[PDB]
Amino acid sequence: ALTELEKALNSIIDVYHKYSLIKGNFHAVYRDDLKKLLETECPQYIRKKGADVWFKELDINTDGAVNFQEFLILVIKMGVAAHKKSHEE
Amino acid sequence: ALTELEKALNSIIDVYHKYSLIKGNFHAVYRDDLKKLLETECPQYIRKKGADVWFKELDINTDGAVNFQEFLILVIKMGVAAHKKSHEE
Ligand SMILES: [Ca+2]
Ligand SMILES: [Ca+2]
Ligand SMILES: [Ca+2]
Ligand SMILES: [Ca+2]
Ligand SMILES: [Zn+2]
Ligand SMILES: [Zn+2]
């Protein structure tokens, strides 16, 4: 990671691995793991949607866990909301 | 204090604005602007695809520019690709 964009994606990968390496499959963020991720990494306006609501949305293949590709849904939705709020009067 | 995940998204937003503030509509990355972004922010396996190939692919509504939502398509594909490459070699 040499550029700002590459470092940012590398940080996103490290954030995901910080919760997927807790237990179970190394590429699975479970419902309780996601709850800690939301409470630790995300702002209140993302956090207050609830871990259960987010998990239903993120678990695309309905295997009971959130993989990295599914995790990008939360990442992108956080990016849209943060950028939207940055210009919002 | 801002979390690692929040900083990463702010950096992504900063990257986009770095090129959308160049000229014209300040929420628009034009063809040459996107080429500068790809040539500066992105690795080789992204760049080799071609700047014009990326533009045609990212400019979904064919309005002549890449807005923020369209730019996130590149971020997603780069995120998946970077994660896959981080588990190589
Ligand atoms: Ca796990
Ligand atoms: Ca899943
Ligand atoms: Ca512009
Ligand atoms: Ca467009
Ligand atoms: Zn903006
Ligand atoms: Zn991984």
Numbering used by the authors:
A (entry chain D), B (entry chain A): 1 to 89
Any passages from the paper?
As for all S100 proteins, S100A8, S100A9, and their heterodimer bind two calcium ions per monomer, one in each EF-hand motif.
Although zinc can replace calcium in the EF-hand motifs when present alone, only Ca2+ was found in all EF-hands of our model as judged from the anomalous difference Fourier maps. The two symmetrical Zn-sites are formed by two residues from each monomer: from the first monomer, His17 in helix H1 and His27 in the first EF-hand, and from the second monomer, His83 and His87 at the C-terminus of helix H4. In crystal form 1, helix H4 is not involved in crystal packing.
